[model samples]
Target: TSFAPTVKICENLSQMSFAAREVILAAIDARVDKSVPVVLALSGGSTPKRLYEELHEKDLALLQQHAVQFILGDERLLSEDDEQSNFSMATKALLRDVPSSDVISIDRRAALATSKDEKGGLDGAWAVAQDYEVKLLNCLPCKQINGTAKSVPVVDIVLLGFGSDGHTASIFPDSVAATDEEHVVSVSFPSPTMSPKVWRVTLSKTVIQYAKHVVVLAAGKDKNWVVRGVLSESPTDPLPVSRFLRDCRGSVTLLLDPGAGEGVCA
Candidate 1:
């Protein structure tokens, strides 16, 4: 079955950012009325930065009122202060005023700090992934899957940014991360696809499939081809973003600026 996302196209980046904020706020408001802590999974990118700034300007009060817990959809395995750290970027952009306890970081160093033997590298990173999975299982609300009671951690909303190559989060095309079945996985890129070129942690396809809402943001002419491909290409195509869209069990919305949405059908 094809996954048809609600496509919202804005005239420009600023408009796109505001529109995304509105969608996010609405999602949070519904959750807030139910008196549940809003679990938000955020991705890192320039497009998301814009949304964060919009949220900072417009939705701080709502965020606080809802008692939001922020989780990363993916992160580089580095110190929080590193330039490549998604947690650092998110903090500097939107979460600075929020309670530090509400922000979850995927840095493996924090996990290794508690280990007796001081395990490091991939082993330490995997441990961090496992720890994060446990945290999500405990922190987020449980849901029924296929008529069976399951502990699938369903985020209230997940903000994702599309790569120019049609990747979402860290699940790049044909990468091991794309096919991972674990809820969280430690991924090492075979090539320097991203800066720092190091191991990373990412929420896997299983986690994304269970999210209550998945919002994808894309902007600029550079992303035109990718946006078009994911929205219109064959299902057999291996674009990770497309796969996520196709497989997501809940509502999915694709927000795009006019430049990126051009030639793309809803």
Candidate 2:
């Protein structure tokens, strides 16, 4: 009874991609200006890679025509060229060859604040997160709301992938990322689920919920716990993604494959 999303049970990866594509196209079509690019924040994961690959093959032309900017929802503190980098994977799968003017990537060195080495300490990552927040505010469209003092940055679409532990966008189960109001935050290693053990900057739940539309991808048996967390039960709801589910104010579409949808669709 937290939040209900459009739970789409997909037959396969391609099917999921196709469905996600429709969402993107809808956002594109809904835009009034032909000049302003649609901003899409993307996630780093196998499911997102597949979706990007599908986009490159089928929707590249449309995206180019309408003008779209690709922003990484979260990134490891690795060179964009580094193999393990989220931007690298997304670029390889979607952007094709050559540097894209439309893509906004995290500046790895910029995160290396003083006291400091290139690898960066917490201060550095936090600085980087602040930098990312600035860029995001500039790139995204702001909605004129009832409030006079503040406006919400409304990204056209945000695509994300959930970790089995119920983390998403570098936010761990019990990290500061779970309790933030800012648009972005920096998370360091062993926050509990830093797989590659690299510090990273990520969009916060505030920004995720401010988007016009949000998409979440989950597949494979590893996602069983996440499905259960979002759908069925809870205890303190320790997972950040679970907290997100409980609090999102934006429209959310959750795509699931058979492996992850096991108990979800039943």
Candidate 3:
């Protein structure tokens, strides 16, 4: 792995939740007073849902006083109000008090990209991915690199949660999403052992590389292998998370509960 993470092995899930919220809050505190908008990229899963609830308990006056924006690292192809929508989960868990404008979600239009269009060319989820990337360009802060004519937008903070197979944000092992160069891509895969089989739009590897921080939230016995894969210095067929660690220029932090930590210590 190119980026060696600051790994925190928590005693339990509750402690992990607090630690995750604190890491995010620390970033928020630094720039909340500035005129710039504070951006938090959210992850969709039960683990992050706990952190959202923890955030809900706090008095976020600083966040409210200035601008705050929430973008999901990945979103299921559904209406924002759908039970399976990541934004809906975050809204119910934490963002209910925050004004709707603060959160930049994948519009319901993404869901409308189903089946073929009139020409039967560039149909379905590909359209969703392209349009979403355009929206992201407008929201995220971008700067011109020394070498390129174009600018790269940097996500200030991103929360990542992997599946048991070490897939993070719809970037699965041996999948095309793992290699997409665009800012975002629409993923379609058969259920990975009961995980969602629906189309999901996710931030691509290119986007993660420019992020300021990528906090990985991992837990449970099922994810023990993911923890092990992350700690390993090398692997033949690297996990998706492992690939991110190699590709990311930003700092990576791993917050794990006892269930995921297993034998991982020191």
Cα RMSD to native, each candidate? 4.0, 3.2, 3.2
TM-score of each: 0.85, 0.86, 0.87
Instruction: Return the top candidate by lDDT.
Output: 2
Is candidate 2 or 3 superior in lDDT?
2
The order by descending TM-score is 3, 2, 1
Model 2 lDDT per residue over 1-266, tens place = 65678888899888898899889888788878878888888888788888788888877777666467788888887777878878889888987642367777567786533313324467777777877777766767776445455455677788888787788787766656767654444554434444766777777777787787889888888876787677654544433354565567778888998888787774
Model 3: per-residue Cα lDDT over 195-248, one tens digit each: 555666677877777788888888888888877776777763444354556558
Instruction: Name the best candidate (by TM-score).
Output: 3
Q: Which stretches of candidate 3 lie over 4 Å from their true place?
A: 110-122, 144-150, 236-242
lDDT of 1 by residue, 1-266 (tens): 45878898877778778877777777766753556667889888777887787788777886666567899988877777866778878888898877767776554775434323322455665677788777777777766555544456778788888776667777766656777764544353423354555556778877788888888888878777767666764743443354556778888888888888887654
Taken over the whole model, the C-alpha lDDT of each candidate is 0.71, 0.73, 0.72
The residue pairs found clashing in candidate 1 are none
Error of 2 at 165 (Å): 1.1
Give the C-alpha miss distance for residue 35 in model 2, angstroms.
2.4
Per-candidate clashes, comma-separated:
0, 0, 0
